[model samples]
Target: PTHLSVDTKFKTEGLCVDIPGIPKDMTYRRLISMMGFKMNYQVNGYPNMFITREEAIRHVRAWIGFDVEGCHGTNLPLQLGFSTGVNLVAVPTPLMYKGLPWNVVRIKIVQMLSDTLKNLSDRVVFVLWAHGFELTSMKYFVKIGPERTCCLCDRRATCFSTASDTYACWHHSIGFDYVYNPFMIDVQQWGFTGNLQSNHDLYCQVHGNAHVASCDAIMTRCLAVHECFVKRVDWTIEYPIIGDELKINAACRKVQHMVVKAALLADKFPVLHDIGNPKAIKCVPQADVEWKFYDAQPCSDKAYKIEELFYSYHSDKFTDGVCLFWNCNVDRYPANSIVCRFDTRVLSNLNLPGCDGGSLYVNKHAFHTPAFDKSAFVNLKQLPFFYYSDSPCESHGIDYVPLKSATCITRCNLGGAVCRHHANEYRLYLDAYNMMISAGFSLWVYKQFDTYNLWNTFT
Candidate 1:
């Protein structure tokens, strides 16, 4: 009986305009009493909520988002909110006081909004936050099985699933009686966290009016729009992968060498010498450190297969870690990626600024014997060199880093080894930082490690 069917009564919607705001009292029931956004969705029933950058601009003028607040101990949602740019629609369960029937409130909220939802369906990207709880309220919860689609499907399903990743079905969850789109997005699933500054006004307000579902829905719209439209992030677009080469525009191109980062598991002295030092020291392949490279690049892509890269060096001291490349991204010169380049560029070996007194850090900049040694992989042009950045290191984490920019990482900067905070979070922003992500022509993990083979590879 929980399964919805097209024959259901409320599948057709009649509401044409958005109801403006929440009422002063919950008992009002005028437009579902306490309320939620007026969107232009029904202007002509063509459907619109920005999923694409261009689509966003057209309907950037409005959106449709929802939040469902739960009652203390029941599956019954205590309140339901629908929000748009400036309008809001709220439907609250009348309390035990009004002698108002709970069934009446519940069915009314579902039917009324089902109409709007049926109307918007595929045309608008219905935004929700934290699908775990939100979908339950919307009745869209279904756990995925190993088969990769819906766990509820007993046998094999060969529908439109490429890799039936995490998905939600509106018809399955909300009830089939109404026509609706299965494409609503849980913003949190896409990687926006609660800590974003754009979320500043909405979270943890200790029961302020901000706790209302409709109001909370507004903030979800805020984040979705701000990130997609203003920040220009393309979550759905795939960055092209070209090969081991870096894409330099359309015509110009160059060979990209690499660096295999090693985590030499050792009690001490993981790296024996400073390749960055011209005369102070000398070395060949050895162990690794969180801050040092064990071996240079050749079949650098091999580094992605951590087991093989660490195969020979597998000792008590080392484990697999990340790889760094150079002249790679952000700055025009090699700085971002620490991978070495051949016949193209280099001024010095990748330097760890203030490591091990003068012993650990790269000593060339200090004007010593020289920066890179003439003994080892001494193709100076191939050595990883410094890439400059105007971005500062005032704090840490993705939150502090400037938009469209990266901070500096070095042997030593301010007080110690001033490395830029990791910007891994930006991976979620996808196209927001293409300089941070470019050239597939293509191209481009360590793992627990199966998740690695699936998500990280250059084939």
Candidate 2:
């Protein structure tokens, strides 16, 4: 739905090929040059962007200048073919699928780069032109080949990709399900797939960021500020007390002046600053707010305790758990002094390895499980004759359907001005006008029928 133009010189840097066992240095440009073509745009106007499977490979070979299948012995891993139109670009993966017998031709692209090159500062960059064509190409390639199983749960999965060296399943990745606004109808269509305001992520997505403060060091500052705002926690309570602030300032004192200032600034945590100071906004304490920490059994060392450390919240098949003990003197410190920490043993609780580690958090928990329904299946052939005709507007055009059918309408109204266009006020008025005309015609026909007398019609 969105058209984007990319420059060949700069845009081609991020494009990637999905060939498995390919070296990290291997890439489109590394194998071939643009030659005469300096720019390429997505083929948006074409109905069939890709051709046959064999034909698509031929096009790639032609553009790259060599045959990929026969290049096993040659120095080049892949050869480039020539393209007359530098401005025209289409993914070979998509073309191969649409062309009848071409659908059977499947390509396997390496989902992730090798770990050996992970630490290297210099690496190959591939350009993904025109609304992430590289991503589109990768999807088609994966679909055509073998079934892609999730790395975490081993379930058939899609969606959720990482810009890192490889693709990550949705569960391993954060913010894939982040939504902009629940009330907004077209929110899904607005930006790239995963995007949301700060409040939504810290507050609504997880919970108050400050609610899980560890000690006096990280207490004063708003660790959970983003989560608090997102959860709609009162702002007054979101900010730490004077003593907590002193502790935070003192711990950060040893760091560079610039770093300390940056830490306290809203720039570090964009969500906390975007909402402004909690105290100035008539904020209140969330004492009654229920805390639910994730259930993880990390390595236990009674004498060794970590400071206000950060830990990722993760779980398998929803479960409830609590922290070992309060970090600070609970009697003296505000309730917000508790911070989250990760331990290796916690990973064991989920049947995961200790290498992944564990985390200590507040009462906040994230639980997800598959839903099961055991209702009996109903057969369509057993239904009555009129059971199919359940349209509310069928009996009378002028009659309004119950509010139950107006779910979309309710959502539109809740979304405010942007949703007004979705209401379709013009269509409603037109339907009402048509109903009036039909009633008038029926009345005229009834009055004009004099030949058929009342006695004959009655019998």
Candidate 3:
């Protein structure tokens, strides 16, 4: 199981609370900080949900300094009447349930996505797509809490939660007694000897800098690219294109610039001063390392329309709906674009608001609330499980669950040399190892064991 500290502050009903002093900040970032959220996904045979669930519960308990095992489970009825369910109500409204009893907790489950792996990669992808149901159930939880009735669960009103532990057998306790520290697995355990490289190396190659000081920096750039380009489309495409066409196109253009800017920064410096070190390897054997670039294909305006989901006709529901979209990997780079010709456009015709869903099916799609771009990220397509909170609850509800999760040990095989990425927002895809021997954990070896698998196989 993967372990993380539950000792952090998060948004509580729009007010930010410092975990130590329990100080409240009215700013948006403060609210975001108070959220106790995580993304859950699988690496090998491990189902990260059990530990991830416990970690989130623990954080909420510590934030409020309470251990009401049933409090988190009974969030809705305990606070508001059945509305948007408990997760949605509590996730954005952490402060409402803070220092109070009967709070709801919300979490997002996403698939661990990487071009580095072939199998189980979709395991991460499929998991994330399934997450909407969970979040939807959260709203359902809130609705049932007050009325003590839910359509999503068959158990008693509170059994959904109290039984959660019994269902999973690992997270059943109140104080998170069953919560265990996640195993520290080294990300660079595999020997990825291919033209592919670590995101760090990709950063180093793109920036011209020999060495990268932080993977978080790289991740930031990547996420920023996604936010501005992908998420920004709704706004941009709406500018000139009729019916959101121009808006989507404009957003993609802006995002394209952001993506190249990341590479451009890396292209500026060499990752290592020592030319012999692989980290310093700027040259690909048969291909040019500077061959990567971003491309924004023409996307269709009509596909999955924005879903304005209602909360059981309840007045207490926090949000009217959330915006979602998906897209596949497009090859805009020189070699691939010039040689291999494949259709990689945004798919539409699904339960999304951006582009056509079925038309743009790719490896992954970022699920975000275009309404809340201030903190920027709601979740990433790369991971299996990731949740989001739209706003701070106005009143006590379920324990709030933010969209935060443990970062998976991502591996990138470039030219036979493997690059790794670990779970830190600062350096999300930094190379954690030099050679395969020093790599942290081997998914291959782990595949044979009965560990906590973060996948759909067991569920």
Candidate 4:
């Protein structure tokens, strides 16, 4: 009786819309805004395929936002909610599916994933607000070890997303398939400081409520997209809100309507206004407070090989890739040394034409950057600079010019606390909680229940 027992004959594919628990008063305008081209009849073959950033966002197809509600005592999800910006769908957790035995429900959920995205070699923006807790529940439901995939030519594709380090759900093969990119956003991170925090609060003033799976789904979706489009945060694989790959080149079926490629533009990247709070804590436990510092190794490249990625596919022409290489140009600073990303050596395999293999890095902090002399150390304070579109165009005679241009001085404060960094570029990780606190070995709980009678034993 799970799946509401939809008859195969009644699973008609003609002239009708099907959304479980759909509102009675739903309208055309609402459907269009929520479903995008997903509901479009003319979008055949690629009817389910949403291929490009503009088309993806315009149709709420670019990102799939997820959230969950659970029973704390039993430690399991009662329900799970997902949002496409175009439409929202909420489903009962496997344990809660149609009042079935929890073990049976787990098998059903695993099968569901296998049929759709769980086993596919495709990807998309699969996001969660504070991903740890919900991801833990997802892991329990999926019940498998992790396995990553690769299309190979463009870049290596993996089931493990950049931000999914802490969750067992991410490590296991049971990832939210089709959502190849794991971008669990840090809304309170220093980079997004004073940026979208207000937007989030104002949303509460207008729409109201959090913790409800549906509400948080929309909330996370709005802020996630806002930081990208409006704020233009860094899309570097290091950050979670945007994953490693830009194009939605998911190459599988089962989740067919959602499989298509789209051109993601440059503007979605974060505008790093140079140099990057909360104790709005609910229960101050026994008069204790905690804080953390992240060691983001921006120089260590993850998915893409440096030469082909930044060197414009190994051609002499470097395009927007030069943005990371641009320095503020103070003589004392390590110009010839660390710039953006690469350090010491360029690529183990291929080297760029002119330079001696050291790629770009900005010596932001005092302690980390290697100093030939003491001139470029100790730039601890935050600086202000305008990101007006006027380009000084340093790497002159360069064949490639970047798409959109804005240079920001990344505004941040390190009041009272001192930070030691191993990274040059600004990145976000969800493990800040682990950094702040340590936990002893905690047992994972997965309990299943069933009805039994003595008649079977007698037989």
Total backbone collisions for each predicted model: 41, 51, 117, 31
Tell me each candidate's TM-score. Answer: 0.26, 0.16, 0.19, 0.26
TM-score head-to-head 1 vs 3, winner: 1
How accurate locally, in lDDT, is each candidate? 0.30, 0.21, 0.22, 0.27
- Per-residue lDDT over 1-459 for candidate 1, one digit per residue giving the tens place of the 0 to 100 score: 322221222100111112123222321112211111122223332221113334433332224566655533133435556663222222233122122233343434334444443322222345666423344333322112222232343322111222333222322223222212222444553544443224624322222235556666656665565445333423333222222223232211112211132111211233321112122211213324434434422221111233443345413233223333321211121111223322111222211111111111111111101112222222113322112222344444223443333222222232334433323322322332232223211122112212122111212
Worst 10 residues of 1 by lDDT: 352-361
Please give the distance, in angstroms, between residue 311's alpha carbon in candidate 1 and its true position after superposition. 61
Q: For residue 290, give model 3's deviation from the true position in Å.
A: 29
Error of 4 at 220 (Å): 0.6
Q: Cα RMSD (Å) per model?
A: 22.4, 27.4, 27.1, 28.8
Candidates in descending lDDT order: 1, 4, 3, 2
Candidate 4, 319-381: lDDT as tens digits: 211112211222222111112111223221111111111221111110111111223323211
lDDT of 2 by residue, 1-459 (tens): 221112111222222233334343432232222211111332423211222222221111111100111112112222111111011122233011112111222211121211211221011112111122222222222312122444455533332333332223323323222110000011111122222223123322222223211111111111221222212222122221212223322322211121212222211221111111122211112212223332222222121222212223222211122111212111111111211112212211111110011122211221111111111111111111000011122222133333222222222223332122333432343343333222210011111122212112111
Cα lDDT over the full model 3 = 0.22
Say which candidate scores most in lDDT.
1
Evaluated at residue 242, the lDDT of candidate 4 is: 24
Superposed by TM-score, candidate 4 places the C-alpha of residue 342 at a distance from the truth, in angstroms, of 40
Better by lDDT, candidate 3 or 2: 3
Regions more than 4 Å wrong, model 3: 1-13, 16-21, 24-165, 168-295, 298-350, 353-459
Instruction: Write candidate 3's Cα lDDT for 285-380 as tens digits.
Output: 232223322222323222122122222342222121111111212111111011111122222311122111112212123222112111112122
